[PDB]
Amino acid sequence: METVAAIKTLIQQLAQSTDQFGRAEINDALRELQYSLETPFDTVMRMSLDTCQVAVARIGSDLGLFKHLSQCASPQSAEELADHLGCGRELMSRLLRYMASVRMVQQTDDIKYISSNITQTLAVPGLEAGMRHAFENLWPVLMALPDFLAERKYPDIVDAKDTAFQKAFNTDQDCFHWLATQPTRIANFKVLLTDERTPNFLSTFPLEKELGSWSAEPEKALFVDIGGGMGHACIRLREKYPNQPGRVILQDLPPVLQAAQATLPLSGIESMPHNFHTPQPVQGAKFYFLRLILRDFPDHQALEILQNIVPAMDAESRIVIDDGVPPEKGARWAETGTDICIMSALGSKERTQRQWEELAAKAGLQLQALYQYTWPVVNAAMVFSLQ
Amino acid sequence: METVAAIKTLIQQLAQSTDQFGRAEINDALRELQYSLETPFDTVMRMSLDTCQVAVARIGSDLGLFKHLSQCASPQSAEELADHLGCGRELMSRLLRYMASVRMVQQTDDIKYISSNITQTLAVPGLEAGMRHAFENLWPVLMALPDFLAERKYPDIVDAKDTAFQKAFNTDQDCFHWLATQPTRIANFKVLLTDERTPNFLSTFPLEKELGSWSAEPEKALFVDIGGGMGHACIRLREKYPNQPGRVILQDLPPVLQAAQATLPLSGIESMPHNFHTPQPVQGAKFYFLRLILRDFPDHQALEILQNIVPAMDAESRIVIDDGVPPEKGARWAETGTDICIMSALGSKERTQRQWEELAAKAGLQLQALYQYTWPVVNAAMVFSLQ
Ligand SMILES: Nc1ncnc2c1ncn2[C@@H]1O[C@H](CSCC[C@H](N)C(=O)O)[C@@H](O)[C@H]1O
Ligand SMILES: Nc1ncnc2c1ncn2[C@@H]1O[C@H](CSCC[C@H](N)C(=O)O)[C@@H](O)[C@H]1O
């Protein structure tokens, strides 16, 4: 139809006219429009069939199809893709036809296949690891959730050792300890840490304003990245503020600190093994940074993590929580869906700004500023001080 | 934003101006636009989180939340819904917040919850049964598909007894025989048959033209509904052509024929137990009707079903296959996703128009006409004759 072509042309022009945050708003609008115009039959057909995307993406990941296709300079038929990757010709054909229908690849007028924007994404190892994480970990969790809540007469999940994860994987350990005994899952989790989300808090964080007259002399610590993974926040800090004095310390576990040495700058950033369930060793640091850490623990354990940092704070010291702050109403699917997943696997929760201040007050902390850096799904850096 | 409000209003006006087929075109365009304007990070987030909808819908079905909410004349807070349904107040709150974000319910400005169009859909027993089927029968099979194809070095699946279904449920039976030994699954499958798809082939089927000078005298059968479920095709046939003489026979298994007696007309439609893997008993009938039947069997078993009907055909007899006919290129997700699901659970396949004629030629049949009645996803009634 000419009308649907006019809609595509029109919405494309509007998307290119705004920024990434305007585009995120448009995508949520297209999603609500789809859900509001589907017939009752289409609704069930949509929920049933969108499950296939994760499973089919995993199949393509196991075959290296997205990586191989991202390096092809010419359209490929189904037969050669099946032969080069070692797959049955008929099986490959049906997979590609499905992928093309959900834009996982692109199909040409002569029934050949090229890469789409989703194909390039699935070839990036950090993002491909996120999709495999969804298939092999959270899917099973999610699938055990409804029968788990029925047997327990629908309780409020508040314990990391009593949630759907235990029934899903037939163990009594929590998700963190159980992961260490699984080598292939640890390997994938390591690749997953190499993906750097963008933008980061430094795009709106007024460092100099929050710094004040704090002095790095003699050799105080400027930035302590507690559970910092590959140290992306540390790296982006030295890049944006290379002249700012003060130590920049990446704290994590020895396994991931060893992996981070490959991509760390030769100087500027210290690697320091630390378990944040234990007292913080660095004293009087300006910023203690927690990005996507406290959302993986229930309120009683997230408080313990904060209670181990408080004894090491000066009056100039600030605890910075970089995490999602969903609104009290009108929350988007990207911040309510994660809330259900971490509840089922970790017994934790997403927290509104109010739930953050209530958790922080129990540690003796007080909110000083809140600097959002994503829209419409809110990721903010919350600056906390003593008193 | 004012911009996203203008898009919603504009597409709503265009949606109400066209028919159901035009709206299906618009929804598919909105989906392609969503997939093409999402950041690489959003793509992974979408596949991860859209999985929750099936799990969350199953939870709401287990609580009767969608049925209860569809009967409320005033907005309900999370606390009152939790108490009436026997659910934890905090657990209910997070569930409603997630449902609201995916339009599974609607949230009000004062944080209360009412029904949406999806809520009414999930309250219809036939559609709720379709969602429960996806959770308990489809989802597991899919979860087992990628590891199944890896162990077998990615073969072409052509056998109903050697697919992901066997690994998913740790049995050696095919899906049909294993289903009979499961009481709760049989009950849900029975409710699933009560949902009537719309429109049906009678919206474009030229009965009088295809009927010709066929005489019902002495007592020939006009319509034989082979595997007809609740007999919806039979009922809509007596309704649209009530004066057309001839017997209208609904054929299925004793379990579902007995369940269909509740909604069958008092007269007009005969119920006849029959197993379509056995020779057809009704002789010289005008139309032998197969709706969504041959889609569930591989080529070797689907042919036997046709080979059992051929011996009962006159020269005037016609076999009518009502099924999906996806195009050779550009197939929509609704007809490629089902192809992957029936491959994984039943070892069968969706068939293009030529693949249908190739299957019918092996039975001695010849395509006479093809009457589409859905767009853009093609469901057609294909009229076959002998020779
Ligand atoms: N007990 C513990 N002590 C210290 N670090 C831990 C820990 N348990 C988990 N972690 C670390 O916490 C990290 C969470 S992933 C978050 C990484 C970083 N905050 C970012 O967003 O870029 C993982 O890298 C993991 O190694
Ligand atoms: N071996 C068999 N013999 C006869 N009917 C069978 C059968 N195996 C399955 N069926 C029936 O075939 C139907 C498939 S779903 C049927 C939907 C219906 N024919 C429609 O037009 O929409 C079920 O009702 C099931 O009971």
Numbering used by the authors:
A (entry chain B), B (entry chain A): 1 to 387
Which of the paper's sentences describe this entry?
Recently, the novel multifunctional S-adenosyl-1-methionine (SAM)-dependent enzyme LepI, located in the PKS-NRPS gene cluster for leporin biosynthesis, was characterized in Aspergillus flavus. LepI is considered as a SAM-dependent methyltransferase that can catalyze stereoselective dehydration via three pericyclic transformational processes: intramolecular Diels-Alder and hetero-Diels-Alder reactions and a retro-Claisen rearrangement. The overall structure was found to be largely similar to that of SAM-dependent enzymes,28–31 exhibiting a core α/β fold of alternating β strands (β1–β7) and α helices (α1–α19). This structure exhibiting α helices and β sheets comprises an all-helix amino-terminal domain (NTD), a carboxy-terminal domain including a substrate-binding site, and a SAM-binding site, which is formed by a seven-stranded β sheet rounded with five helices.
